């Protein structure tokens, strides 16, 4: 049956776009960091780019160094870079190709639009030219990330009405460039060999329903989804202390929903990750945690590792 | 400054209450809890709890379906919930428009506009107080910048409008509406932003970033809910290595939070063993926003959650 890990994705030589998403606070940032690290360690001759498309960025916080609109290598690694788009500064560097920039810089949607433009300018870079091999997206929570992924479709339909209107109102080739560019992006996003969406969730009632809507929504967009990370699991029966009323009670809830998840998502890689005692922060800890996306965590075997994170 | 939201809960001036914070810290749980407390404490006022998170969870929280039209919470006389579906709202007023980024924030802004108008006219389906279960930090900031953003935007449009049905008047009409929202949103007695957070590293810096940003918009925040606290030293169970180690970390940051935000109502809420859903469990949970949670005394409530 389907192995409970991301080993196939981590060692993949075909995927160019990897979206990590899900409900607020399930562990998208933690998971996207971990996936990006595993791919980087697993494929040393490739260059990877982890971009946060969440307007409230946490990559800088997680690694303990400042990232921005321009990609920077993670300190300590040779092939992993991070980026956190700043709408104001990104529009400024077009401002200083300056009112326009700041105005549009705060309009709702700007963060989704500039993330999309990042994809666009990456497509143009690949064709002509040496750039990042695989790009992993630390996305915003469900609601807005769905907007982002509708954009190839949304812009395509818009650019049809736009063209026939702007030509009679009153440069036309600039439309065709984007119109074709958007298409290219949609082709790659609906290609399961080039693009995939890794869902993150927690085994709690409120995250269950939202995760299922999300997955269905993505499938409707012809977006490949075949992996689900169930994060922050207690595995209370393996503590070998078997006490703490709260932990046993919460694990009972988790385990219950974990059986429901297992049953519905039989055809998905269902990757189960433990709630750690320490902080998943800094290169070392993120790396130590990431290994369990590659080789499934065993509560009986690797039980001590949740207590072995630096402080 | 007392570690509770009693004054906000019993406030008779506030019209706009934003409940926000990082993803997954407890915005939805807290906003429901705040809305119940206020509705219970003020039975003569009508309360509306609106979700501006495109991934709505109010319906899931209460266990009943809500929509764009306000509906009363079953079991409450003066609390209603609203969850606007963009594609379905525009159909009443273009499905591609319902998929455009920012459309969620726009329709939410229009909803605020509808209510200030009806409140001004003393006519129409109205609510005395609107509480917002907001999207996470990033997009909520975009929403609260909208009065400033739209203001500048309508100025520029003025010129390129005069470039070529008496349209200038409608721009002027919008400028005025926006201006009324800006003054109400920046009035500390009418509007406040309640921050929800958890005592963890990634939450601390984002929360601080958020508050500093809200203040630059002349938005009031004097309330911070620190949620999902373990209180391990009070569990009466001095074991479980994970809880002890996790609590030691929570407690460490908790001292820092308490020191920095001394001017704020710092409300501490426990991690529950049960599920906080349904009116009853939400009501029981919400009591600790009005009267601070004593881990030594109120500890039983952690397991008293209906299932």
């Amino acid at each position, epitope marked *: 049956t389907v192995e409970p890990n991301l080993h196939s994705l981590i060692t993949s030589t075909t995927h160019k776009w990897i979206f990590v998403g899900g409900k607020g606070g399930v562990g998208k940032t933690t998971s996207s960091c971990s996936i990006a690290i595993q791919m980087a360690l697993s494929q040393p001759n490739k260059q990877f780019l982890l971009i946060s498309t969440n307007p409230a960025h946490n990559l800088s916080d997680a690694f303990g160094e400042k990232f921005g609109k321009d990609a920077r290598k993670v300190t300590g690694m040779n092939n992993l870079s991070c980026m956190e788009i700043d709408p104001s500064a990104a529009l400024k560097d077009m401002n200083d190709m300056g009112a326009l920039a700041d105005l549009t810089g705060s309009i709702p949607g700007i963060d989704e639009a500039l993330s999309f433009m990042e994809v666009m300018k990456h497509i143009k870079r690949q064709e002509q030219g040496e750039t990042f091999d695989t790009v992993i997206f630390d996305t915003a929570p469900t609601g807005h990330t769905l907007r982002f992924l509708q954009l190839p479709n949304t812009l395509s339909k818009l650019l049809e009405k736009f063209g026939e209107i702007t030509n009679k109102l009153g440069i036309s080739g600039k439309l065709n460039e984007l119109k074709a560019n958007v298409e290219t992006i949609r082709q790659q996003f609906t290609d399961p060999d080039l693009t995939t969406f890794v869902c993150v969730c927690i085994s709690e009632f409120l995250s269950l*329903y939202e995760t*299922e809507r999300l997955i269905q929504e993505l499938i409707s967009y012809d977006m490949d989804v075949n992996s689900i990370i169930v994060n922050q699991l207690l595995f209370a029966e393996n503590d070998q202390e078997h006490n703490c009323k709260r932990c046993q009670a919460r694990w009972k809830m988790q385990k219950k929903y974990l059986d429901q*998840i297992d049953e*519905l998502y039989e055809d998905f890689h269902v990757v189960k990750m433990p709630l750690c005692a320490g902080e998943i922060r800094g290169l070392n800890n993120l790396t130590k945690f990431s290994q369990f996306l590659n080789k499934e965590y065993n509560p009986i075997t690797d039980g001590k590792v949740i207590y072995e994170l630096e402080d | 400054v007392e570690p509770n939201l009693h004054s906000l809960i019993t406030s008779t001036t506030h019209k706009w209450i934003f409940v926000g914070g990082k993803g997954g810290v407890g915005k939805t749980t807290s906003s429901c809890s705040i809305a119940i407390q206020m509705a219970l404490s003020q039975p003569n006022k009508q309360f509306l709890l609106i979700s501006t998170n495109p991934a709505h969870n109010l*319906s899931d929280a209460f266990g*009943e*379906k809500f929509g764009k039209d306000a509906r009363k919470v079953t079991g409450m006389n003066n609390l209603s919930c609203m969850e606007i579906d963009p594609s379905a709202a525009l159909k009443d007023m273009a499905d591609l428009t319902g998929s455009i980024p920012g459309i969620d924030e726009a329709l939410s802004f229009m909803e605020v506009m509808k209510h200030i108008k009806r409140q001004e006219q003393g006519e129409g389906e109205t609510f005395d107080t609107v509480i917002f279960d907001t999207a996470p930090t990033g997009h909520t900031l975009r929403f609260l910048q909208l009065p400033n953003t739209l203001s500048k935007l309508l100025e520029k449009f003025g010129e390129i409008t005069n470039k070529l049905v008496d349209i200038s008047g409608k721009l002027n009409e919008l400028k005025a509406n926006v201006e009324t929202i800006r003054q109400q949103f920046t009035d500390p007695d009418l509007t406040t932003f309640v921050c929800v957070c958890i005592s963890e590293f990634l939450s601390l810096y984002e929360t601080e970033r958020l508050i500093q940003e809200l203040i630059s918009y002349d938005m009031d925040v004097n309330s911070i809910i620190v949620n999902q606290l373990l209180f391990a030293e009070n569990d009466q169970e001095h074991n479980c290595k994970r809880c002890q180690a996790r609590w030691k970390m929570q407690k460490k940051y908790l001292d820092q939070i308490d020191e920095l935000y001394e001017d704020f109502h710092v409300v501490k809420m426990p991690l529950c063993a049960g599920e906080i859903r349904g009116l009853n469990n939400l009501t029981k949970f919400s009591q600790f926003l009005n009267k601070e949670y004593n881990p030594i005394t109120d500890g039983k409530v952690i397991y008293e959650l209906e299932d």
Partner: antibody
Amino acid sequence: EVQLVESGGGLVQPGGSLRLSCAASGFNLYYYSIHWVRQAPGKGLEWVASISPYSSSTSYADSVKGRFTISADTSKNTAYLQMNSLRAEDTAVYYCARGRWYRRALDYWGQGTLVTVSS
Amino acid sequence: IQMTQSPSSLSASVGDRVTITCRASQSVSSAVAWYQQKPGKAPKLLIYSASSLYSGVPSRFSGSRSGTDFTLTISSLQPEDFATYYCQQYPYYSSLITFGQGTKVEIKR
């Protein structure tokens, strides 16, 4: 104590309308999916409609799509089936049944209500 | 799109092992359930997920999957096991519910 109770079945002339009701108890239907399955005389089971309040999604069999409408009042813990443009073929015993968000198999059923369509 | 249930009827005696087959037009993974319907009564759920036995159902009932072929096996017919049986598919990629035509298991004498 989980159970589903149908009602509203009766005789309707072709082209007419009829509203079926499925009262649920023992659970909150909001968190579940509710289905209508019918059975023509001497025939087998035929799914006609589903509703899942927790996703705002509804679904219809082609044979009834556009003519029927499924809905739910979550405050009354009751689901409904509005049948318009009825025909002789629509004659059947109509069941309501329950499904789960992770399992679209029907675990609980009502006793069924008889709808007959003829002039 | 169309679930073919066979045979449409079958005679057997108490103690016989019987097998009912349902063939799916397309791959629906393991999302098939089996029901039992007695005259005048609502169907009862027996098996879901092709092979998982539903709560309260006796152990003589069994289900297996072989590709798009699904089987319901009653290892040793009891007097009460005689009824009509329906398979049902509920594929993850769809919101459709599709039943087989049914199998009427009757007593041989």
